[PDB]
Amino acid sequence: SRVAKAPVVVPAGVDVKINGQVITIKGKNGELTRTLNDAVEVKHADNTLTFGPRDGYADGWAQAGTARALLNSMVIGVTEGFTKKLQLVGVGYRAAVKGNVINLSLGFSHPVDHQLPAGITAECPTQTEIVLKGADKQVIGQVAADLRAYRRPEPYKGKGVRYADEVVRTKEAKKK
Amino acid sequence: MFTINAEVRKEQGKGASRRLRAANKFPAIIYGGKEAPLAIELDHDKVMNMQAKAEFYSEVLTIVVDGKEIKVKAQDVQRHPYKPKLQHIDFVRA
Amino acid sequence: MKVRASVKKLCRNCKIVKRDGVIRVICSAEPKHKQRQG
Amino acid sequence: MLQPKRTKFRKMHKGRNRGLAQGTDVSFGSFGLKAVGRGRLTARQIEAARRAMTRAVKRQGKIWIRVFPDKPITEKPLAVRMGKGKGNVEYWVALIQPGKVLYEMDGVPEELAREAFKLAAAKLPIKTTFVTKTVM
Amino acid sequence: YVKLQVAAGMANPSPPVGPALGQQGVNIMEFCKAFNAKTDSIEKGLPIPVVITVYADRSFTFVTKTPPAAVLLKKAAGIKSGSGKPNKDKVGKISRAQLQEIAQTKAADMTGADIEAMTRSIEGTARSMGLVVE
Amino acid sequence: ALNLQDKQAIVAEVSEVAKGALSAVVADSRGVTVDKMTELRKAGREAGVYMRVVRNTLLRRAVEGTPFECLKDAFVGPTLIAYVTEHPGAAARLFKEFAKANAKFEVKAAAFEGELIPASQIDRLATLPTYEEAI
RNA sequence: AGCCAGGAUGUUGGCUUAGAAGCAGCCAUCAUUUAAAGAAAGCGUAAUAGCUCACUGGUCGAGUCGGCCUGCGCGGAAGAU
RNA sequence: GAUGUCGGCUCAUCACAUCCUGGGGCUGAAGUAGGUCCCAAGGGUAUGGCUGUUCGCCAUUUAAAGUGGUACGCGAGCUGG
Ligand SMILES: [Mg+2]
Ligand SMILES: [Mg+2]
Ligand SMILES: [Mg+2]
Ligand SMILES: [Mg+2]
Ligand SMILES: [Mg+2]
Ligand SMILES: [Mg+2]
Ligand SMILES: [Mg+2]
Ligand SMILES: [Mg+2]
Ligand SMILES: [Mg+2]
Ligand SMILES: [Mg+2]
Ligand SMILES: [Zn+2]
Q1: CA–C1' span, F36 to G12, in Å?
Q2: Cα–Cα nearest to D101, from D70, D58, D134
Q3: Which residues in window 17-36 of C are less than 7 A from strand H by Cβ?
Q4: CA of D127: how far to CAs of A4, A86, D42, in Å?
Q5: Which residue's CA shows the smallest distance to C1' of G55?
Q6: Where, per the database record, does this protein carry N6,N6,N6-trimethyllysine (chain E)?
């Protein structure tokens, strides 16, 4: 509602295509398409996008706020883009990129090979760092969660795959 | 100055009084002086909020019964056995 | 996870959330405060 | 644990527990714990609740118990058939009707009385409400 | 960077100052004699507070502060140790002339603007240790 | 929580000190510890300067009563006032050294003669000496 | 609500303890500079440090907070062909 | 004008309040090994010494030796302590 009422400014170079509930947002950093909930009425006009409830839909304003939020990060995606940074903590824990595949050494018998999806690219500045880049905020978040899942940070030494901005609280082992 | 709006009761008894309370209203009585006692009906929410102030039981209140103004004092109160509601009020003519 | 009929906030970092018709207590500070009504 | 010191008779008819309470106002203290429900309070329940409210106020202020368990309750033990006399008195109850002020308190702030009465209410078999003293 | 309270003409023993400041990287014989050379003017039997400022090259510089408020109220009332239960047990007495004596000494460290502002700050230290104003 | 009785009283106390003082200094003080502030409060009281942090809404109200009704456009961001009630100057010099030595903040604008002084031209009330200099 | 910034001085309050410096306990809980900052709500240290809150200035710009009387629902809810 | 009782043997069938194996949250979970709760009924789930015993105690196993319903399942199926 406060989110829905806030208009999304479409910058110069960003193309907006609306086919009813289907919205295509084209930019320099790629193209993203989303189908908005029927309760959402989207209006283009000027260099902005406005969102409102559709008459007869009980959750219109809650839906319009979600649609707003989504279209705002679609616009950011196809212009600036998104960046998720992960860091490996632990002895022998190393990472490398070979095209669209992240090779992860994480204390297992077999090294882990993670296949990246369309639109997501990775680069390892260090053997203990993964930098993901993409237009889709949801897909980059999913890939970062999938990579972290291979070895989630342990509470005794902070070992595992963590997000760069992650606070890993450690604890002492049971006494005696 | 507390101003209570009241209407004279068109009925009396158990049935009529329970019907008033089911309609968010409650019976009350005004007595004292040479005048005949006057059986009235009050809006529950209006009088409930008023009596929350300690001044309701000490000050001279004014009951407005069909245009006419009656100077009174709260005499007795019958409260609901366990709910924050009023069942009946006695007003004495001041 | 504590599963019980009476689920409450146990500290300021506790949050009551309804997920799929189940009342839960999710805490950002204490894992022992994580509850599910059941 | 409350109990009559002596009684005219040992045993009592079951009786019924119809009606609304007598003694519905806060008569001695500033706050009260009032019955919203109907039922029987045992001497053990009354003592458990008295203990809970007393610990809560750190034995500061003053507490009144407006209820008294004066009704004797008999019970027949296991492996005993019907009849052969009325059972033996095991415990004492107070009959409670909607509206009885069960306990009263003063000499403590409202927030502390509400908490002490919240703790005491959790020991009781009947629903209660927090009440305050009124002008008439 | 550490804060300590060492005696007027005494600085060297292991239990009070020894491995407390030595663990960081401070010279134990250099500070102990440079501190007593400057605090020689300060009267015998008065704990004087000193703040240490250490750098990356193990070097050090110190600024000497005026004796504590809970320290000066003991010698003014004639007591060695304060009350175990303050305001519940009285251990001594100090006049209005003695309150202004501690305040005029503490003026270099106090935040107060007037003499009455600094005197009330010593009045609070006296009440919280069991010493009554008489 | 500040009530309207409190708000009216703060406008009253700063409106009174506005009339009596000669040179007033408006500046920023965000990102400065209390140790350095209690040090500028000791350096202020000494130079006969009144130091305060007031809500910019409350200032626009205390300043409306003339002659600082030009300092309005400096009541955007954290605002700290330096009212010199004893001898014109003192603050405009005290703030310039405190700004340069601490690097934090920028010092918004100064006021004297019922005229606005920009952030660059604060060298006018910084070069002025004593009262007490004409002899 | 979020976000920026501060969260000081006497002082490491007194007693106790190898140490207790807001943060084992016990007692007191004022006063100063103040926009505001408890002689300290929790985590942390052998004790300090360090992190954050109560509180306050800025930003933002129109609503926001949780008690009362009530209707209908939700969890609590495991059994044998 | 009769519905045969305890225990065993044989043969089972269901529930789940789960003994093992499977998944998971918390742990006063370093690991190994545990504690507790949630999900889960697919399969699996000792032989002996004593006693009519069911049970129980004991010996030695096992991943484990589950808890209950079925006329305290089962004598026109057996036994008869
Ligand atoms: Mg009838
Ligand atoms: Mg789910
Ligand atoms: Mg705010
Ligand atoms: Mg027959
Ligand atoms: Mg189950
Ligand atoms: Mg349990
Ligand atoms: Mg099975
Ligand atoms: Mg075993
Ligand atoms: Mg059988
Ligand atoms: Mg046969
Ligand atoms: Zn919590």
Answers
A1: 22
A2: D134
A3: 31-32, 34
A4: 45, 55, 15
A5: F1
A6: 33
Element of type H or E holding E100: helix E96-106
Distances A113 to A105, D44, D134 between C-alpha atoms, Å: 9, 68, 76
CA–C1' gap, D68 and G36, in angstroms = 55
Residue D13 is assigned to a structural domain of this protein: no
Residue D1 lies in a domain: no
What is the domain extent for residue D106? 21-136
3-state class percentages of chain D: helix first, strand second, coil last, to nearest 5: 20, 30, 55
**Any idea where the domains of chain E sit in the sequence?**
2-64, 69-129
F14 inside domain: yes
Name the residues in C1-38 having a C-beta closer than 7 Å to nucleic acid strand G.
5-6, 21-23, 37-38
**Dihedral sign, Cα of residue F95, residue F97, residue F102, residue F104:** positive
At A94, list the tokens: 């190393």
Residue with tokens 């060298």: F123
- Is residue D76, in this structure, part of any structural domain at all? yes
Q: Which of F50, F59, F55, F105 is nearest to F82 (CA)?
A: F50
- Taking the stretch 11-70 of protein chain E, residues with Cβ within 7 Å of any atom in nucleic acid chain G are 15, 19-20, 23, 49, 65-70
Q: By the CB < 8 Å criterion, does E111 face chain F?
A: yes
- Taking the centre of ligand 10 as the mean of its atom positions, its distance from the CA of residue F123, in whole angstroms, is 126
Distance between alpha carbon A13 and the CA centroid of its chain, in Å? 22
* A69 belongs to a structural domain: yes
Residue D133's closest CA among D94, D107, D97, D115? D107
Backbone dihedral region for residue C30 (phi beyond 0: left; psi -120 to 50: alpha; all else: beta): beta
CATH topology of domain B1-94: Ribosomal Protein L25; Chain P (2.40.240)
- Structurally, at CATH architecture level, domain E69-129 sits in Orthogonal Bundle (1.10)
B72 - beta bridge partners? B61, B93
Q: Which CATH number is D42's domain given?
A: 3.90.1170.10
Give the residue on F whose Cα is nearest the Cα of E108: F42
CA atoms of A114 and A122, how far apart (whole Å): 11
| Whether B76 and D21 lie within 8 Å, measured CB to CB | no
Count of domains for chain F? 1
- Expressed in Å, this structure's resolution amounts to 3.0
> Does the domain spanning E2-64 belong to CATH 3.30.365.10?
no
Cα of D101 vs centre of ligand 4, distance in Å, is 66
CB C10 within 8 A of CB C27: yes
Which ligand approaches the C-alpha of residue C28 most closely? 11
